[model samples]
Target chain A: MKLYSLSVLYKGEAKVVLLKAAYDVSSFSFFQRSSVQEFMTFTSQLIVERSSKGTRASVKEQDYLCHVYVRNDSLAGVVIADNEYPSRVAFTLLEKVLDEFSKQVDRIDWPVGSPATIHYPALDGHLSRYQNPREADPMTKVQAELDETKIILHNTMESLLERGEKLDDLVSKSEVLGTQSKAFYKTARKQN
Target chain B: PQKDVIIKSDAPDTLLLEKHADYIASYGSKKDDYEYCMSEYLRMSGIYWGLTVMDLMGQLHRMNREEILAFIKSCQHECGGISASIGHDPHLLYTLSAVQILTLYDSINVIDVNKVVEYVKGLQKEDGSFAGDIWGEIDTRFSFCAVATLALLGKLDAINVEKAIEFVLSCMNFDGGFGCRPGSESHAGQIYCCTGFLAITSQLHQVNSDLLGWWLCERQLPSGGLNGRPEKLPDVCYSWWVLASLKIIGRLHWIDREKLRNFILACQDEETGGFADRPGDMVDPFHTLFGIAGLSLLGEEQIKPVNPVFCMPEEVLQRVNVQPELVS
Candidate 1:
């Protein structure tokens, strides 16, 4: 089976490194839509195995969840992973059709049929170590840059959290103190 | 809508060389649009743009050290950001390009570090990503732009680093590459995005090192050039994508340098003063930059030394000195 793949390396300071892969899928032609669904299933499993590797001991990892589902309107396989992280990862698989009737843009379909697909193992993290040494070893200058940047982040978040607490306190005082007096006046004085 | 939109090659490579020669030959007392223009206009900043293209393509000849320096000086904007043209727009992209170019040319004296830094700071988005301008729609592209901008400026410590790293990590996926957002299709441009993001944020370890590196290396073909995707026809732009990706990963020496250099030099249209996706084609601005940049990555010294990560010269960083303040 063939698939399209792309990788992006995110270091702290330099530009991102990106690469794409595409392959032929002649061996699995007979499976039809079922194969596409199977690939989606297997891809999710692959993601689960490798996804947690993004964590590093340098900073507390932001906890966010992602959901992968086949896109609607796609006869070909389409899987989308949406997460709270600013990044969105997507995979698209399509079987070429001959003798198309129209030249219109194809629509994507969701909730297609399911099957099992092959999972290519996680390739080594060679490209990921570009200009950033912070991930593999944070004691260096690269790590220091990240550490400094992390401090900036901690300050900003701490401030946001502080403001949230202040707002909560103000709301509690207004609701808890004011509401009781109003309830008492209505019950005891019988003011309509 | 009714007009015929014929796609014609504006400057064929052979013709481009002829045109360049003609311009050089007629250079004395030749007065035209660029001649009367100020150093800051995009029209006048041709040298800077041209320098970028040449540096990327590895064909920056016919230009000298002095010319490259003057060109960098000419693009300085009052806002501290570099402008596409003198007295024109003081853009963040151009500012970064200016710094990168000057650094490559060893001509950082022309830069106003304080202004450039301030302008870059103003371009940051609420989410820790940067906008090209005040408008805040974000993408992996601009995110890389912002990080490289600051890194080149030596001021990566001012922004919220964790959130920025978190933002970049959020864009990663199971395919070993990154997309614009989680679940988005991984692409060549975004490959630069995530790689650059990690490079600048110092967090590339989040990705698979060897698999990603080999995948990038495999992008090269018999032509000795690279492309955005496997099996796709080779394009000049990917020379930067693949090469810079390799350079940043510290595996640049792994490739057969001789063959790759031959491939890069082969793509140049000796006559046209530009480069093509492959030999015997038309040329454009982006491909030209990548071609020169690719050569610089290969350690070609005639033009100047380019910082493989930032696609500019290392000299400029020293000229103004790298400012490592207030960058995230």
Candidate 2:
């Protein structure tokens, strides 16, 4: 049930604003410092991919599982967790972060390269509060309990993708994005 | 969900093999102890873990085998599934526990083998997944339980082997790990169940070894202990999940063996003689069994070889003539 890192990114047209980044340092070690950077970079790329192309939003890297929930309105929440971490909790964390991001995104002025201009201590508090899924906020508990009865968990993520239904097709058609944003994703993939 | 506890340098470094045997030997006798009474729901697995670890340490005779067998017999319901304790509901988890215990004692006839087979067979859903009980909750853990129970009984034919393999395979993620169900995330515990399922079904070749092995080896923390998943605190139990998965994939040496051994040894409670989830944590039989079994996989001389797939003594597996496949 370890949640290593949580970050909220506002993928505006000109730049990606890293609104907040929180780390659970108890699990961090001297040996893992560089690895943590690499992990964050990988997750950042995942955010870019989702923001640009909007394909499959979740990935499992080694023992860490990364989940990205992108709001149709350019705000995206990313959570990196242990594979044993509950999906409901991770998604709920993302949902809460996005909710907060929506309210605050307009109030704060964004700096071009550094998002350090704005601080989100409330987001960090949410990270600390939801670290333990069982003790998360009341609404999350209700959703988790409801999910226990309603959700049909599949064996693997691929099981969710149907035959002949490409993830690209799902994203391209379902995502209410303009042609320029789709082209931006295409260019981003090419640059990578 | 708890934060990872630090293992101090002063933690115990030596394996308490004898102390562990003694600890298990005298564990449940109190009957009136609070912990003993509270553990009635998992008494079947409790006995299995104790007996298997003792047998691995060449201390099997210390436990009352006949009484243990009698307890198992009393727990078997008319429906053929065995419960963790008498009067408890029957479940596949405890059914496998009872079968493993009987197998260790070389007395499968103590209970109705046919009813047990029927019991396991009835739990199979149309999609080849197994429910833990009549409650209809599904998990890969139950799938392994059903197959292992039937395999121990020499009745793999009783269940839909192909469908079972399909369901387990469906749980496999792109990372070469497995989860509880389709679309669920990969977990070390669930990976053990899936890999063990493949070993039982002889589908080892289907796994992408390098991908899964890399994921498994990363479970090792700087503390020399392994965690069930990334960013989690290391636990002694993961030594079994990660070690067993590595062995099944023929990559057991990928991790630091000496460091892992040190970590597992540190988890031993020098006073009570059982292993804890981490160093300085309270000791329990479940972690005790895995700590010992993990050592065996690392080729510890004092302990007998453990079958990675079954969590049983290798000799017990041989006695039953049920050798599951393993990658070289």
Candidate 3:
């Protein structure tokens, strides 16, 4: 029902680097927006790096479902959305963001760029216009490659983790996520 | 541009008590009005909104009490449930509306009270959820409607109270709020129903007051209006739902009171005497009722105090002798 964050990233040799991002965290409490933003940035980067080039996947984590597409050229896009948002629409949106992003920015800066250094401004428009799923991109199945994009669906965030690795452990030791964000993660896991 | 409204200096900024009273007073009399004719689906609740707001403004007599009472009496089906209007199928939502109207008019005797109890009792499921009607669409709203109707009728013991409580409890979420069903996302409107249901059931201690208050108070936007969910625009009706929930949980003061009041007042029409969902939008009885009811909780002395649980005037609830628990 809602789109949280949209980001364009680069799958570098060692790690994924965020290029530019747009967020609609206005729905979260003012105190929690920063923590939520941190968690989202962390998740987006983590998902992009695990995903192989020329692949699209939807990773489920609690109430949120992150849809990511990593291009064969190492350009990538990640959209953090509620489970209610359509996966097909999310993937198509990623195609648009990645395609438009490659044309506007120089390829030489992909490995070293950060959100602060990138100059792409269209992600905000894409995030806002795509907030209502039905409103955006009626002309899907573009470029024939989309018809055969072969997306991999993930039922859980744990599916992306390597053997013997755990999400709870990652949360506890995250250098980027703060103490309060970790507490938020713990509280959101409660059933009641 | 975060999702919020702006209070233009030209907007109405003070209570329009007489205008709101006049608006509700003349609402149903227009036989040829398309707005009136189109609202037949929930006319009973519409009547409740009008009459309750009128009563709050000390203008209950302005409504046609005798005509309304007769209409409600005739809407009752042989199966004991009341419909929204004549020729419509009986539903729990409208049944509660009719009961609230009757209770306000002190005319519960206008319909069959015993059969009404049976109708409400028949809707309960093994899991303690209540269906809206015979077609069997289950929602937590119906659960609140069932108990609130029974409580107002002095027949709280007629149904499985504990069983009913169990279902609503299952709908609670990690944020100390509730949704329409188990595992559904928490919402402000659903939280109001669940919290109100718990208060009526004398189970106030079950709520996580600190956590729930944090989410509820955060509904306030810079415009001073409240939204039903996060990142959504502010609405007049949520002012009642969210504020009432906050009141029941004793967190009413957590919000910016003066700011909310200004946003709510700006939603009023300088000429029409009703509140809109936002400034410069269409006005109606639904928002009109909640707008007045919300201000009552905000300490607006022009209107009477409102019961956070039932949304009825405190004096009217006192008259019925139905006092639900509120957190201190």
Candidate 4:
């Protein structure tokens, strides 16, 4: 119970950190003025109890097979049974619970743009055309994007080299990017 | 930033008709790479040599064992050496390619093996690193190909493995990743050249785990795709990068398996029978081989089993019964 409550605090705190970092990185001007902070706090509070309590607390019971005789003598073979049980059976149960939780967690969807999209306009609006696919002019479009980014990176690096300064002073913190569509998968056997 | 780039294909006639300079110019003038522009031809020659080596081990895919033999017969030029196409530059790299291709095909009758070896021997510098030809850009990719070509022919003792190992190790960044020449930035192909060089020479323990593992894991994106560098979008080429590097480091789990498998399968075009860098993109032989190889590393079935770390056919690598053998 204590650990679960701690987990709730941790998740709530982490979500706050992520939201602030997102605001710093996002091009959406709405974040600059709006009050999404309250909603983030509320969502984190809701998720904290479910993720940390609703599932993990049940595992300590029913999972180890504690018989009265074994508990009296403290000679239970519960650990052995847990290991000896067919792994596929355990994994199947795990998959079912995880699937249910994933669906529930995904309900708090926060749409974000893809990394490539963020990188282009964040660097420059007009230069964004180079990084984005035109469908009609892909051959030259991607090439120009690569060239422009390469130049920007190179110039930044050259200036840094000349200045001989640390990055800590240049930026406050790093933000994660990438909001493109993703494909999910499930594997049966482990890789060699 | 990427330190080096390599371009290769089965289109020999394309190189012959277009000429080497024409292709380099397409990348935006010879000034783009300066004297290092010679890597273009060397890259082609490396492909030729690599396929021939695979042929020797009876591992060439999608073709009969005799296919490379027929391919070599079509590559001869009127000059003293072979060309990129049927009629082009008679360089040393292609000459070695032609000789090795013939030797792998068991058609040693068509070429003078001893003369071909002698020509390759002449390309070596006093410091013992082999150049592609007279133009000296000093690349580990060409160096490994040169050593492998000689080793297959039972002529490795002629070159100084100690000096070559020194050169290759010098190219090893603190990250256990390698780049072209010494002290160049780490990239994908250089990982193969340097790691494959060390593995073949039985000196892989020199790799630094912490840095290599960090670099390897950084390649994986949230989409489960791998990219060559941090902060870049995922691409097909990174399948080779993350797999080959992690294989060497024995940390294939540096990224999540299910995510990578999903990324690779999504790239496959079931109807076209090939894989690409992304969905709805054109498929090529290079991406096709690498995509399959990446999945094999992830323990996929119905494909020829591959050694995850080394990316070589398991059967051929199985022949090595020693301490240095690849981990299953």
Candidate 5:
């Protein structure tokens, strides 16, 4: 029923770089917003790296359903929302954001860019404007395009990880995460 | 997957009194923002929420009393009914909120008390239903608001008592819950008002305690949060509505108090100092009051005891000598 975050990323040979991201953590408690944001950013980047080119997938983590799209050109976008949000609309938003990101921001700068360094204002608006799915695609002009695109749904977040790897291990060892967020990961792990 | 929030290990487990007091203290200081302008419709009620919560936290002195009283005075129209803001039209709901505000301040003479009685009298129909405004739209919520407003002004005798109780009783469903009107679906918000109405009028014996208590406590989900209806995500707002109604009926023990206390605590914003609808949602004054009030019902010592029937500090109700009855 609510969209928590929308992020655009670049999947390079070495690692996935965050290009730009927008979030609405108002639903979260004040202290939890930072950890929630960090985890969302971390998951989206990881999902993009593990996914194959030109494929779309939906990752389920507890009550949250994150829809991801990784383009053939290595451009990726992810939307984290409640389970009730239609995957069709989420992917439509992803394609639109990725298309806009690729067009506006130069690909030459993507490798070195972070959310702070990037300039893509439309991502925030799209995330908010699409909150009401009906209003976002009122005419359903993209309806046919949705049918042509194939999407894979992963029932759980663990399916995305390698057999030998653990989410906790990746979480603790990541230099991108702070000491507090790592602690957050341990508590947020399957309390449901 | 079930719809609920996972209470993280680092979630706030204690009441952030100073932070919440500060969050509400400076809430209205900014006037140029869009959130304020758009909220003009419920502006008066918003003040009541802020002041009441402030009073509960023992921070009533932090709010600007003179400025608020003047604003309330300016919003009272010649019709005796109060508007949400200065230029807006008068209605029964705002009238009740303004009355609640005045009652808290112990300044009933600030507005025309006689006109307020007249406004309540005019809104009541022969069938015992009340309209929210001059343009008639009937609901049980307005019925309670009318009764509560009158009760506060010591004018409950102005309306036909037996007939008003008749209309409310008629709205009771087989589920042992009351809705906005007769034959409507049972809801926790209306149940709170209807139960509160019964308590104030000393009609507590009319409610089916065991049956209604089950429906109310069922609002609690696995997350330890309460919802207004079935299969819905738990929210902080319903925490008070459902919990207060249960408390009013003397069945507060039917639900899981410990999990709910933790859930309510988790709804608190540590840095900003307000409660949100759920653990990670946006914080607002309305939810902030309910969250704190719900905690009081759960026996949180940091918050002053809130009257289940009135949703106000019991100390304030004691000041007015207006104690509502609760079922055994």
Candidate 6:
């Protein structure tokens, strides 16, 4: 399987500012580049909601599957994976990334505006390192085996709600986002 | 965040053929290396990439045929699917890789041919999409793997070709590129799969050559290395995907050949002996195979000609007596 993209986002006064993003270009496609960008934005928002709701980890299964691990502390990590990817491996990746991020910068001292960092070679190296799920650390391997029976395989995030749910159901169910963000989602859908 | 998307002007300018061949030959020699251990899930495909590139460089003799054949033999499961490694799960991707490795050695008899045919045939859904495995996740890439494996074995009729073609076409986007599934955005990797699928099915006529050609050629970055899509950095592997797609559509000359040749050469890790995604990244077998294969496509005289449809040596395809249709 492939890990499409990885990102870390922080909640801002307006929109979520992506502190860092790394992509697996070998597995990525040209026309789908913008789609990935949109996916990351949508996932970042979802993670923000999870952070507010005190959820530790979630898997958003859409056309593609995104495995997310959010810290209740506002620092969130996301791993965009293919359908066949094992959940334990994705979470392990998030743990490793967030650990690295933590070592580099203090969570309370996260920079405003852009971080001024141009590239994440360390993160990119991790992406290549973890391409094979079997390469994960010993703990992750054990966790993967233990999690094998408990992981819920979701067909789509919408399926998690009432029968025949849609985006509106999410808006109503969460009831967290301001009308401005809701209007932005509606307008963004039409523009794209 | 701002990204470093550009390649420096002082990148390597020559194709280090001997260095690359040496790199691939020496890779995995240390059986207990970290990369070797980590790559257990895809050892079969890894071997295929290594072998194909070695053969293209006319260095196939350097690889161990008997051992590789044995490995492929061991990977074959009871249900007929071949796993990436012996203890791994059987999958369509690894099955095709095993078939390719066997075909290269002219040893198709080494594996259970009839069982493989049944395995591939069993994965086809009612709508014609093929799952990578029994998990039932459908994508165009698996569609290519199914047809490519069957075509090599001379068993295309084992599955419903009409339904497969219809499913692939449904993934086509308005920009004349195909995606993993219908209504999904187009991607170069999926485009290669769909294009290769059509070629094997003799449905090249169904593709919009000019429209798709423009999209594929646009993947060429200022560095000369091709990227899978827009807003991405140049990578050596996309050279194979985009160039192969262009070749299938009879538009191989749509991009600047010499410039691309320069870009691929720069991706080589002169010290390590394999190519990487970008100029100075780590080298791996996947990029090594694609780099050499891309050079073969660019008409590098020392490299053997590669079949765009199969990513195998043209001579190997000839031995199988299966020539997929190409628009050009």
Query: Which candidate number maximizes TM-score?
Result: 5
Give the distance in Å from residue B270's predicted Cα in candidate 6 to where it truly belongs. 2.1
Write down the C-alpha DockQ for each prediction. Answer: 0.01, 0.02, 0.02, 0.01, 0.05, 0.02
Docking class of 4: incorrect
The deviation in Å at residue A26 for candidate 6 is: 27
In candidate 6, position B84 carries an lDDT of: 96
- Alpha-carbon deviation at B94 in model 4, angstroms: 5.4
Candidate 2 on A85-143: residue-level lDDT in tens? 87666776677676766566563453332447655677667767887888976575546
The C-alpha stretches of model 6 lying farther than 4 A from their native spots are A1-192, B1-5, B31-33
B1-328: candidate 2 lDDT, tens digit per residue: 2334445566788877889988988887666777767888999998999899899999999889788889999999989899999899999999999999999999999999999999998899999999999999899999999999999999998899999998989988878888888989889999998889989999999888889999999898876888888777788898789999999988898999998999998888777888888765567788889999999999999999999999998888898899987999
- Which structure among the candidates has the greatest DockQ? 5
Model 6, A135-167: lDDT tens digits are: 877665545544653444333354344456576
Compute the interface RMSD for candidate 4. Answer: 16.3
lDDT of 3 by residue, A73-105 (tens): 887888998867877778778788887887878
Q: State what share of the real interface contacts each candidate retains.
A: 0.00, 0.00, 0.00, 0.00, 0.00, 0.00
Model 4 accuracy (lDDT, Cα) = 0.46
5 versus 6: better DockQ goes to: 5
Error of 5 at B141 (Å): 0.8
TM-score of chain B of each: 0.70, 0.96, 0.98, 0.71, 0.98, 0.97
List ranges where model 1 is wrong by over 4 Å.
A1-192, B1-46, B52-82, B86-89, B102-112, B253-259, B284-286, B299-305, B315-328
Ranking by TM-score: 5, 3, 2, 6, 4, 1
For residues B1-328, could you state the per-residue lDDT of candidate 6 as single tens digits? Answer: 1112344455688888999899989988776777567878999999999999999989999999999999899999999999999789999999999999999999999998999999998899999999999999899999999999999999998999999999999999999999989999889999999999999999999889999999998888765778888766677787899999999999998799998888888887767788887765678889999998899998998899999888999999998899887886
Q: List model 5 lDDT by residue over B1-328, tens digit each.
A: 4566667676899889889999998787787578778899999999989999999998998888899899999999989899999899999889999999998989989998999999889988889998999899999999899889998988898899899999999999999998988999999999999999998888989788999999998899887999999878788888899999998898988889999999999988887889988775568899889988988888889889999877799999999888877887
For candidate 2, the per-residue lDDT at A19 reads: 63
Q: Write the per-residue lDDT of candidate 4 for residues A1-192, one digit (tens) a residue.
A: 000000012233233221111111132245422332222222223322233222221111111211010111101101101212332222222223233323433323312222232222211221122222232133353344334331111111112232465333222222311111000001101110
Clashing pairs in 3: A27-B231
